[PDB]
Design a protein around this motif. Structure first.
Motif, short mmCIF file in Angstrom:
data_model
loop_
_atom_site.label_atom_id
_atom_site.label_comp_id
_atom_site.label_asym_id
_atom_site.label_seq_id
_atom_site.Cartn_x
_atom_site.Cartn_y
_atom_site.Cartn_z
N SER A 413 0.82 -1.20 0.00
CA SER A 413 0.00 0.00 0.00
C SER A 413 0.86 1.26 0.00
CB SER A 413 -0.95 -0.02 1.20
OG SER A 413 -2.19 -0.65 0.88
N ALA A 414 2.09 1.18 0.50
CA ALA A 414 2.91 2.38 0.62
C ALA A 414 3.26 2.97 -0.74
CB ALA A 414 4.18 2.09 1.43
N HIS A 415 3.40 2.13 -1.76
CA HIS A 415 3.87 2.57 -3.06
C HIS A 415 2.88 2.38 -4.20
CE1 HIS A 415 7.91 2.40 -1.08
NE2 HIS A 415 7.42 1.30 -0.55
N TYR A 416 1.95 1.42 -4.11
CA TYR A 416 1.10 1.04 -5.24
C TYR A 416 -0.38 1.28 -4.98
CZ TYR A 416 5.53 -1.30 -5.77
OH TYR A 416 6.88 -1.58 -5.83
N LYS A 417 -0.75 1.91 -3.87
CA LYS A 417 -2.15 2.27 -3.69
C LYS A 417 -2.55 3.37 -4.66
CE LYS A 417 -5.59 3.43 -0.29
NZ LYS A 417 -6.44 3.33 -1.52
N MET A 418 -1.62 4.25 -5.01
CA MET A 418 -1.87 5.30 -6.00
C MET A 418 -1.56 4.78 -7.39
SD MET A 418 -2.68 7.68 -3.88
CE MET A 418 -2.42 9.24 -4.69
N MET A 419 -2.42 5.16 -8.35
CA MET A 419 -2.13 4.87 -9.75
C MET A 419 -0.76 5.41 -10.15
SD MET A 419 -3.35 3.32 -12.39
CE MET A 419 -4.64 2.93 -11.20
N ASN A 420 -0.36 6.53 -9.54
CA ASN A 420 0.97 7.10 -9.72
C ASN A 420 2.05 6.04 -9.52
OD1 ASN A 420 3.07 8.90 -10.01
ND2 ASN A 420 2.35 10.32 -8.43
N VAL A 426 4.61 -1.26 -13.28
CA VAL A 426 4.40 -2.00 -14.52
C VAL A 426 4.91 -1.20 -15.73
CG1 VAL A 426 2.57 -3.54 -13.73
CG2 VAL A 426 2.00 -1.21 -14.43
N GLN A 427 5.77 -0.21 -15.48
CA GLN A 427 6.22 0.70 -16.54
C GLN A 427 6.82 -0.05 -17.73
OE1 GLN A 427 8.98 3.57 -15.05
NE2 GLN A 427 10.04 3.88 -17.01
N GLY A 443 7.59 -3.09 -0.54
CA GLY A 443 8.62 -2.13 -0.88
C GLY A 443 8.56 -1.71 -2.34
N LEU A 444 9.51 -0.87 -2.72
CA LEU A 444 9.55 -0.28 -4.05
C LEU A 444 10.14 -1.27 -5.04
CD1 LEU A 444 9.11 1.79 -6.11
CD2 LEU A 444 10.99 3.16 -5.15
N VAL A 445 9.37 -1.58 -6.09
CA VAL A 445 9.70 -2.61 -7.06
C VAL A 445 9.31 -2.11 -8.45
CG1 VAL A 445 9.27 -5.02 -7.76
CG2 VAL A 445 9.36 -4.44 -5.33
N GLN A 446 10.02 -2.60 -9.47
CA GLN A 446 9.64 -2.41 -10.86
C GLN A 446 9.75 -3.73 -11.60
OE1 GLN A 446 11.30 0.86 -13.24
NE2 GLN A 446 11.45 2.07 -11.36
N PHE A 447 8.69 -4.12 -12.29
CA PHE A 447 8.75 -5.29 -13.14
C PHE A 447 9.58 -5.01 -14.38
CE2 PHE A 447 4.86 -6.37 -10.77
CZ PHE A 447 5.20 -7.64 -10.36
N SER A 464 14.16 1.90 1.08
CA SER A 464 13.16 2.74 0.49
C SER A 464 13.46 3.44 -0.81
CB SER A 464 12.70 3.77 1.50
OG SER A 464 11.36 3.52 1.88
N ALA A 465 14.67 3.93 -1.01
CA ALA A 465 14.93 4.62 -2.25
C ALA A 465 15.70 3.76 -3.21
CB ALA A 465 15.64 5.91 -1.99
N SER A 466 15.70 2.48 -2.96
CA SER A 466 16.46 1.62 -3.79
C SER A 466 16.14 1.57 -5.21
CB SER A 466 16.10 0.21 -3.44
OG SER A 466 14.71 0.09 -3.26
N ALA A 467 14.85 1.39 -5.46
CA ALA A 467 14.24 1.06 -6.75
C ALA A 467 14.71 -0.28 -7.21
CB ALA A 467 14.43 2.12 -7.82
N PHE A 468 14.18 -1.35 -6.67
CA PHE A 468 14.60 -2.69 -7.07
C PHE A 468 13.89 -3.15 -8.31
CE2 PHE A 468 14.01 -7.37 -5.74
CZ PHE A 468 14.70 -7.77 -6.84
N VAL A 469 14.64 -3.37 -9.35
CA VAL A 469 14.10 -3.73 -10.62
C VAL A 469 14.34 -5.13 -11.05
CG1 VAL A 469 14.33 -3.33 -13.01
CG2 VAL A 469 14.67 -1.47 -11.39
N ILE A 470 13.29 -5.82 -11.39
CA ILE A 470 13.38 -7.23 -11.80
C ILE A 470 14.03 -7.30 -13.18
CG2 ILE A 470 12.12 -9.37 -12.10
CD1 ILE A 470 11.83 -8.46 -9.36
N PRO A 471 15.02 -8.17 -13.38
CA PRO A 471 15.58 -8.36 -14.73
C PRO A 471 14.51 -8.73 -15.75
CG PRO A 471 16.69 -9.72 -13.01
CD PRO A 471 15.93 -8.64 -12.33
N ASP A 472 14.75 -8.35 -17.00
CA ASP A 472 13.84 -8.69 -18.08
C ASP A 472 13.92 -10.18 -18.38
OD1 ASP A 472 14.04 -6.00 -17.92
OD2 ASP A 472 14.09 -5.62 -20.08
N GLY A 473 12.78 -10.77 -18.74
CA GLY A 473 12.69 -12.19 -19.02
C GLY A 473 12.77 -13.09 -17.80
N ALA A 474 12.83 -12.52 -16.60
CA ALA A 474 12.98 -13.33 -15.40
C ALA A 474 11.71 -14.12 -15.10
CB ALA A 474 13.33 -12.44 -14.21
N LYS A 475 11.89 -15.34 -14.63
CA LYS A 475 10.80 -16.19 -14.31
C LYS A 475 10.89 -16.60 -12.87
CE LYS A 475 11.63 -17.41 -18.97
NZ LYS A 475 12.99 -17.90 -19.34
#
Ligand SMILES: N[C@@H](Cc1ccccc1)C(=O)O
Length: 483
Positions: A413-420, A426-427, A443-447, A464-475
């Motif tokens: 809820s801290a990061h994804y409750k807002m459409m923002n 899912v960018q 926490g803060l994540v990007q697919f 909090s300010a990490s921005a953890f991003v999942i590698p592309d094609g990851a399963k």
């Protein structure tokens, strides 16, 4: 007129504002109820459970297309994307492949018109906050709906004065006069249909059935078996209900009630049984345990409603051009944001309460796929993923690999409750969730693009300010992914 002074002020304020009379009469009657100290309380002793109902799954017979020619689809469309931090119409939110809730309903309506009945009518109940945005999108995307928007499509929700709790007079808020007014709940639909003159026109044109549901409930689609059932059993009001589960124990439930009514003038005295809804607020404190017993009360209202228009017109005419629903007494301040602003009541009704107003009233158990409101960005993520597919008739259904079970989505809820925050997540793409039982994001994540999730996946990031991003094609399969 024998009105109270407070009531007279409300009439004056509403008449000055050119509020139609049908809304005024309805509101004044509610005002009188509150003047009398009406609790609204529904003790367990005043009701009995409902243990047996027919099931939509058990039905098979489809009505013929003539019935659809006399059907009006009405979608509730007054809500904003407030929950998502959005400040415009929720049905304009992209649901899938660039389509909105509104696209899907319009496409469904168009499909039925092309293949089943050209006369099938489509209405939208708007507020002042959704009307304009609902007009331009139709203008841009469904011109056949735009041409008749004012004449046939739009139903405008009424607005009624908030009243001071101590005096019951219209509250005044010079800082923002608009805060002096509030919508009257989805119960207003009857008041609006009648008052605007629309109920009669629809009956006059020969329309017999209206299907009402939420604009944000993509599960609520025309099912021809429900129309056959209403024809066969001579039902005037049908409420689709769903089985209650632990998550539902705080929500309202269906109930039975035995009433005895004194005959007016030359009428005999009548003892009859009615269906009704009980909410948490209406339930007294001692029965709360009872209220949450899903086994005792096992069904809840989906707000998928099926109504015989001529009987509705009749009933409202017998009641003085109005429908007397239980009044809910919302307690707020004129400015919700300002705790020091005058405390007020906002009077509202539930359109589902009308089930108690009809002699031929029934309820039918439907699968939960017909109750899929998008209330959170979590719901939105599931819908956008490949877990759902689009039918030929433009319905949104689970892919077969889900076996009728949707992916459970728990977004932080801290990061994804807002459409923002959610659109950042899912960018770079929407992960495949067709095979995922549960996905949890903390926490803060990007697919990444091409992510595929199976089984139970948790994605958890500590800084909090990490921005953890999942590698592309990851399963990810049955795992917890941390950075
Ligand atoms: N039968 C529903 C499950 C369900 C039904 C009724 C109430 C709640 C849940 C479905 O599989 O979609």
């Amino acid at each position: 007129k024998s009105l109270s002074a407070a009531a007279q002020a409300c009439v004056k304020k509403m008449r000055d504002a050119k509020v139609n009379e049908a809304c005024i009469r309805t509101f004044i009657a509610q005002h009188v109820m509150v003047s009398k100290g009406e609790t609204g309380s529904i003790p367990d002793s005043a009701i009995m459970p409902v243990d047996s109902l027919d099931a939509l799954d058990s039905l098979t017979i489809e009505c013929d297309n003539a019935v659809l020619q006399s059907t009006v689809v009405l979608k509730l469309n007054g809500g904003l994307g407030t929950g998502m931090g959005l400040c415009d119409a929720k049905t304009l939110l992209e649901v899938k492949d660039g389509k909105t809730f509104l696209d899907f309903t319009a496409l469904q309506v168009q499909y039925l018109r092309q293949h089943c009945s050209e006369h099938l009518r489509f209405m939208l109940m708007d507020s002042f906050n959704t009307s304009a945005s609902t007009k331009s999108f139709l203008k841009a995307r469904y011109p056949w709906l735009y041409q008749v928007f004012d004449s046939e499509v739009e139903l405008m929700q009424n607005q009624v004065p908030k009243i001071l709790q101590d005096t019951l007079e219209p509250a005044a808020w010079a800082e923002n006069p608009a805060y002096e007014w509030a919508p009257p709940g989805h119960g207003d639909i009857y008041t609006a249909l009648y008052g605007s003159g629309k109920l009669q026109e629809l009956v006059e044109q020969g329309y017999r059935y209206m299907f009402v549901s939420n604009g944000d409930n993509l599960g609520a689609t025309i099912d021809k078996r429900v129309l056959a059932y209403m024809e066969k059993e001579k039902i005037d009001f049908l409420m689709e209900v769903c089985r209650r589960t632990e998550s539902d124990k705080k929500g309202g439930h269906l109930a039975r009630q035995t009433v005895y009514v004194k005959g007016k003038d030359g009428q005999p005295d009548a003892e009859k049984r009615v269906l009704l809804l009980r909410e948490s607020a209406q339930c007294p404190k001692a029965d709360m345990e009872s209220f949450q017993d899903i086994n005792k009360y096992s069904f809840f209202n989906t707000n998928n409603l099926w109504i015989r228009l001529p009987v509705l017109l009749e009933t409202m005419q017998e009641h003085g051009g109005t429908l007397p629903l239980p009044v809910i007494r919302n307690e707020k301040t004129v400015d919700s944001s300002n705790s020091a602003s005058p405390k007020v009541y906002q009077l509202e009704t539930a359109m589902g309460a009308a089930i108690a107003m009809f002699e031929s009233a029934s309820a039918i158990v439907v699968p939960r796929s017909r109750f899929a409101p998008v209330k959170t960005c979590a719901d939105l993520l599931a819908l956008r993923s490949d877990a759902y597919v689009v039918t030929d008739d433009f319905r949104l259904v689970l892919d077969d690999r889900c076996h009728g079970h949707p992916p459970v989505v728990d977004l932080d809820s801290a990061h994804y409750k807002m459409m923002n925050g959610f659109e950042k997540l899912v960018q770079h793409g929407v992960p495949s969730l067709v095979e995922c039982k549960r996905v949890t994001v903390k926490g803060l994540v990007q697919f990444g693009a091409g992510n595929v999730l199976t089984g139970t996946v948790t994605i958890e990031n500590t800084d909090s300010a990490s921005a953890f991003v999942i590698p592309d094609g990851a399963k990810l399969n049955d795992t917890t992914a941390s950075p």
